[PDB]
Amino acid sequence: GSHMCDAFVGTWKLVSSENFDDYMKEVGVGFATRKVAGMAKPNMIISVNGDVITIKSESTFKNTEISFILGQEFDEVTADDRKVKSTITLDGGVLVHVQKWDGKSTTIKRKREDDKLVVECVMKGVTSTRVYERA
Ligand SMILES: Cc1cc(S(=O)(=O)Nc2ccnn2C)c(C)cc1Cl
């Protein structure tokens, strides 16, 4: 029957980005990776099978894929090649994705707003907002 993340499931395309270069700088991404990653217009493909959620992020820069159970830490290699320990939870209908590495932390929130999927990436005081629409 109907379930936890139904409104997230599907194929989404990036339509706007703000402050992503600054977010990446704060994370520690180097110049060349920032330039090429920042150009990209990824799709995000979200699916659910039982308790397992899969998020694929695909662009001309990189294809990534994570599968996880809410609340259960996992290893992730990010598109910029960080090796992080991640935990994703649902907080009042928002997917909250925390990545920990080298004593640092970043949080990515994904939420449904109208017909969009809005992604907010936060590293210390710097936020990037990335808006997706259905493909
Ligand atoms: C590097 C990077 C990538 C992302 S992403 O948007 O999920 N994926 C992305 C960007 C460009 N191509 N692809 C697949 C995010 C949220 C953060 C960071 Cl630092």
Judge whether 52 lies within some domain.
yes
Residue nearest to atom 4 of ligand 1 (CA): 79
Tokens of 31: 């110049």
Ligand 1 atom closest to residue 61's alpha carbon, by position in its atom list: 12
Ligand 1 center to 127 CA (angstroms): 14
For the Cβ of 82 lying below 6 angstroms from any atom of ligand 1, the answer is: no
Q: How was this structure determined?
A: X-ray
Structure tokens at 57: 């992020």
Does residue 117 belong to any structural domain of this protein?
yes
Residue 1 lies in a domain: no
Show the tokens assigned to 107. Answer: 């949080």
Distance CA 129, CA 28 (A): 18
**Is the minimum distance from the CB of 88 to ligand 1 under 6 angstroms?**
no
Q: What is the Cα–Cα distance from 83 to 77, expressed in whole angstroms?
A: 5
67 inside domain? yes
> Does a structural domain hold residue 62?
yes
- Work out which ligand 1 atom sits closest to the CA atom of 38: 11
Q: What is the 3-state secondary structure (H, E, C) of the chain?
A: CCCCCHHHCEEEEEEEEECHHHHHHHHCCCHHHHHHHHHCCCEEEEEEECCEEEEEEECCCCEEEEEECCCCCEEEECCCCCEEEEEEEEECCEEEEEEEECCEEEEEEEEEECCEEEEEEEECCEEEEEEEEEC
- Domain count of the chain? 1
Residue 45 falls within a domain, yes or no? yes
User: d(Cα 22, Cα 43) in Å, to the nearest integer?
Assistant: 21
Ligand 1 center to 1 CA (angstroms): 32
27: domain CATH number is: 2.40.128.20
Residue nearest to atom 8 of ligand 1 (CA): 57
Domain limits for position 116 = 6-131
The resolution in angstroms reads 1.1
